Design a protein around this ligand. Structure first.
Ligand SMILES: Cc1cc(N)c2ccccc2[n+]1CCCCCCCCCC[n+]1c(C)cc(N)c2ccccc21
Length: 574
């Protein structure tokens, strides 16, 4: 028989092959950094110095033949293509008429962006996240933000994945006009210019390739030479651990919505839809697409953009077009893909899209039932309430009244139920609506007792400015605080108030607050009670479930209350 092949490990890239080529140690345009191949090119060098070399070789993976070719004397290179990622025991055999001899088996890795070559991720979850047996029909969603791996120090292996059905990854930008990104400060707009170099406008890109796929995380077993690293490699390993988890890229958001306003022109929608198909074929751990255009008709970050006439029909066409493209991918892959969108729930946002039309294309609507009041002005109120608070004036709730100056309210006040009823009344199915919970507060300072028109209620006061604080307190920008910050700095373990704060609750609105009467610091947020109320409301109306913004700001209490409030409930999936 021929001499047995001896595999030249170093001549064969130590048997590590990848279907994706990712640029490391540089930041450049997306199409220069990211190259995907439907088949891996496998090249393995072997030698047969002693004896006869034979005529033909065969390559086996886990004892099954996967390739054959000719022997070329004393040194041969087996080259073939392979589609399926994984770890395999490889043997190379040489054959001629006298018989066949085979190399010792050696492990070959073929990396793919489904994580098929990876072991389940090792988790490091705060044990204050408890175990539940929520029915699997109910949505339990959250957003994980790409930048939370820096100062926020919150990584993929910190998420309480057993308690989540859907992780929305915030956020994939669209190349094009993006002046609103300058409001984040820092390198964000410039990093986007770099990512979009050589990329057509209206195509998606990765905003931060360091965080997405270059950074080595030691908890994930990454090495500098590992071919996929970052958050994305951890998300692939997380999908191996929890295969029924849905991980969905969120495109846009408040900061990154400026290109959507140009989707009135179908040519820019076609460019975008094709880029998203490409993106989902490249990053196979993703399960659909979430569109967070804030907002059709304007009212977002870009004060000079928004078309109340034309953006709704653009949004609806976008959904129709995306769903045609996702049906293509389902045909091609045999998988199921979801299409979702997070939306504004003020009456002035909902009036600009005919959701009765759009929702036929969509699996879920993530209703942004938060941010109703905030430090952008000096008017206190409940930022994430279900119902109208005590502080509101007569007629403010339904919009028929007049304000303190005699001026008509223009529409119903910003509460979750005013928005959810407007969507239900036009025929959006309850089982496609997901209700938002906040894992953060918004706040003011200067709300001292002398400013209240009702002494029992600080939401009747007036502020002098935004809440101020440090990042160790969870205050990453003035006026906003992480829930885990409110717990450590204002509530305490017993939830009765520390550091001069007192807790209160508006039982009509279903909304908690903490208030320090000395400093006038007042923070509106969601807590165990108000999230239980949201779960109960979701069970009562047959909503699909709950989601939250943003997971890194919870200490487990808010996700636990999301589950607790849904106990017993089931829903018909869309
Ligand atoms: C930090 C960070 C870090 C990054 N690398 C980053 C990268 C990409 C995108 C965002 C990024 N972010 C920022 C992510 C920002 C998430 C939250 C944005 C919503 C802000 C509230 C919106 N809002 C509402 C609703 C109503 C108002 N009247 C109003 C008035 C003034 C200002 C805002 C107002």
């Amino acid at each position: 028989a021929p001499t047995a092949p001896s595999i030249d490990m170093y001549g064969s890239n130590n048997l590590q092959f990848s279907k994706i080529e990712l640029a490391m140690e540089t930041t450049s345009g997306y199409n220069d950094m990211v190259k995907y191949h439907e088949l891996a090119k496998i090249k393995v060098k072997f030698n047969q110095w002693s004896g006869t070399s034979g005529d033909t070789y065969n390559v086996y993976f886990d004892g099954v033949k996967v390739a054959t070719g000719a022997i070329t004397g004393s040194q041969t290179t087996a080259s073939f293509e392979y589609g399926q990622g994984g770890l395999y025991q490889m043997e190379i055999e040489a054959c001629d008429a006298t018989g066949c001899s085979k190399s010792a088996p050696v492990e070959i890795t073929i990396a793919d962006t489904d994580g098929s070559h990876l072991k389940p991720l090792t988790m490091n979850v705060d044990p204050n996240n408890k175990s539940y047996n929520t029915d699997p029909s109910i949505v339990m969603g959250t957003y994980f933000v790409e930048w939370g791996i820096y100062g926020r120090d919150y990584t993929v292996d910190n998420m309480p994945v057993d308690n989540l059905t859907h992780i929305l990854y915030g956020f994939i930008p669209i190349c094009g006009p993006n002046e609103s990104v300058k409001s984040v400060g820092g390198n964000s707009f410039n990093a986007l210019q770099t990512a979009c170099r050589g990329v057509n406008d209206y195509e998606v890109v990765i905003h931060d390739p360091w965080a997405a796929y270059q950074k080595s995380f030691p908890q994930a077993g990454h090495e500098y030479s590992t071919p996929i690293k970052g958050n994305y490699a951890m998300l692939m390993a997380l999908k191996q651990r929890n295969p029924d988890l849905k991980i969905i890229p969120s495109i846009g958001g408040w900061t990154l919505s400026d290109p959507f306003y140009d989707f009135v022109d179908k040519k820019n929608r076609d460019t975008f839809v094709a880029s998203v198909k490409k993106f989902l074929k490249t990053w196979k751990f993703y399960d659909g697409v979430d569109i967070d255009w804030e907002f059709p008709g304007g009212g977002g970050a870009a004060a000079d953009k928004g078309d109340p006439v034309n953006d709704g029909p653009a949004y609806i066409a976008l959904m129709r077009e995306l769903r045609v493209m996702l049906d293509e991918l389902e045909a091609e892959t045999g998988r199921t893909y979801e299409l979702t969108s997070a939306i504004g729930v003020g009456y002035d946002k909902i009036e600009d899209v005919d959701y009765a039309d759009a929702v036929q294309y969509m699996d879920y609507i993530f209703a942004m039932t938060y941010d109703f009041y905030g430090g952008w002005n000096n008017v206190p109120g409940h930022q994430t309430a279900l119902y109208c608070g005590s502080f509101m004036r007569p007629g403010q709730c339904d919009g028929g009244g007049v304000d303190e100056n005699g001026e008509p309210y223009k529409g119903p006040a910003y509460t979750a139920d005013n928005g959810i009823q407007l969507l239900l009344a036009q025929g959006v199915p309850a089982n496609k609506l997901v209700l938002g919970t906040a894992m953060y507060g918004r706040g003011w300072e200067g709300v001292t007792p002398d400013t209240l028109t009702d002494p029992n209620d600080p939401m009747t006061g007036t502020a002098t400015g935004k809440l101020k604080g440090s990042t160790a307190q969870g205050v990453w920008e003035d006026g906003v605080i992480d829930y885990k910050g409110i717990k450590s700095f204002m509530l305490g373990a017993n939830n009765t108030g520390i550091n001069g704060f007192e807790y209160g609750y508006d039982a009509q609105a279903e909304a908690p607050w903490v208030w320090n009467r000395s400093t006038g610091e007042l923070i509106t947020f969601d807590d165990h009670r108000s999230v239980l109320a949201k779960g109960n409301y979701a069970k009562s109306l047959g909503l699909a479930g709950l989601f939250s913004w943003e997971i890194d700001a919870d200490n487990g209490d808010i996700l636990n209350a999301m589950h607790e409030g849904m106990a017993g409930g089931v829903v018909t999936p869309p």
